[PDB]
Amino acid sequence: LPTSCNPSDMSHGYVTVKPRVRLHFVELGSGPAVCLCHGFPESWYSWRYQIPALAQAGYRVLAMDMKGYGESSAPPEIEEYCMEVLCKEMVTFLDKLGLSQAVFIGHDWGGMLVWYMALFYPERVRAVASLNTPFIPANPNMSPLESIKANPVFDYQLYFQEPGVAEAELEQNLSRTFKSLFRASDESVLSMHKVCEAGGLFVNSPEEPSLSRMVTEEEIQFYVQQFKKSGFRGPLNWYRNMERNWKWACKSLGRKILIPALMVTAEKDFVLVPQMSQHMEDWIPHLKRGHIEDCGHWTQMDKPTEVNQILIKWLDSDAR
Ligand SMILES: Cc1ccc(S(=O)(=O)N2C[C@H]3C[C@H](C(=O)NCc4ccc(Cl)cc4Cl)C[C@H]3C2)cc1
Q1: Active site residue: 45, 116, 223, 239, which one?
Q2: For residue 173, what are the domain limits?
Q3: I need a labelling partner for 133 at 20 to 30 A (CA). Which of 114, 199, 290, 293 fits?
Q4: S-(15-deoxy-Delta12,14-prostaglandin J2-9-yl)cysteine lipidation: where?
């Protein structure tokens, strides 16, 4: 029920960061620059309820299509989607727009990106906020695979490793894909914890799922249209750089995040659980917190009013 966005009525921007890589964004508002970075497998449009509210609150909002998504380039090579490359391209993005800094707010994979922007490019990050995704320092003595085996919470990510396997499932029926994923906690039709065992996300879920209370048919169809452009290889490639990302992260151990930071947890996200964020204060002294009850993984569309309230209070206080 907050004001949403009609894609045709937005300003659409395009920056070529590298010869074969152009990033698309939508832009609304005047004021301090706030760059919104979505998760997997989402869109700029995942911020549809935030963009008007933040603009109305006196910010210049730039909502990205992240690399691999929507109208942004989606090269096929896996290494184009490591965190080092993605962060270097976000800095390039700011350079070509002529922005010395922005506030970076991310969700899910985008949350992980904004943490590594805060860590490796603090001079370009005015303040940083994550929805659901915690910041956890790399362990230089535990490989990613060892980390999955040891504690198999994220073991669905093994299904995403082999190029072509998860793509065939997710691209088979895009409407079913998005209707199956984009649900409230209590409406779930699949368990991310059971993916490995079953050999897929939707192997035991309805062929024709109902529409979640969170989304309309027209909203689903927007995602469908966006993912017809490049499909799921680029999006999935975000998961296929585990060793590279771990090595890069290990180069930063010990250094803290001292810029203003906000961590927002979601009570009913059963993958990125609130408890994963405990002790972040040890590495982020200037850490503020928020929490949303009755809120699952799809934070922005499950509880948009609460997200908007939290982000605007924090922005008005600690990033301005
Ligand atoms: C330093 C570092 C640590 C961990 C990592 S990680 O382990 O690779 N991963 C954890 C986060 C969780 C994820 C993600 O998989 N989100 C899809 C998702 C979630 C819930 C639901 Cl219900 C449904 C769906 Cl499709 C994106 C993030 C990256 C990387 C780097």
Answers
A1: 239
A2: 7-318
A3: 199
A4: 295
How many residues can be counted in the chain? 320
CA of 98 to the centre of ligand 1 (A): 31
- What whole-number distance in Å separates Cα of residue 184 and Cα of residue 295? 7
Give the CATH number of the domain where residue 39 resides: 3.40.50.1820
Does 36 reside within a domain?
Answer: yes
Asked if residues 223 and 45 have their Cβ atoms less than 8 Å apart, the reply is: yes
Do residues 245 and 252 lie in contact, with contact meaning Cβ atoms separated by under 8 Å?
A: no
Q: Quote the CA–CA distance of 130 and 115 in Å, as a whole number.
A: 8
In total, how many domains does the chain have?
1
Query: Between β-strands 287-292 and 21-28, what pairing exists: parallel, antiparallel or unpaired?
Result: unpaired
Alpha helix (H) ranges present in the chain? 50-56, 83-97, 109-120, 144-150, 156-159, 165-171, 174-181, 195-198, 217-227, 233-237, 242-250, 299-302, 304-318
What are the backbone angles phi and psi of residue 97, rounded to the nearest 5°? Answer: -80, -10
Burial of residue 62, with CB atoms counted within 10 A of its CB: 0-12 exposed, 13-18 middle, 19 or more buried: buried
Resolution (A): 1.5
| HSE toward the beta carbon, residue 52, CA cutoff 13 A | 14
Please give the method by which this entry was determined: X-ray
Q: Helices H, strands E: what count in the chain? A: 13, 8
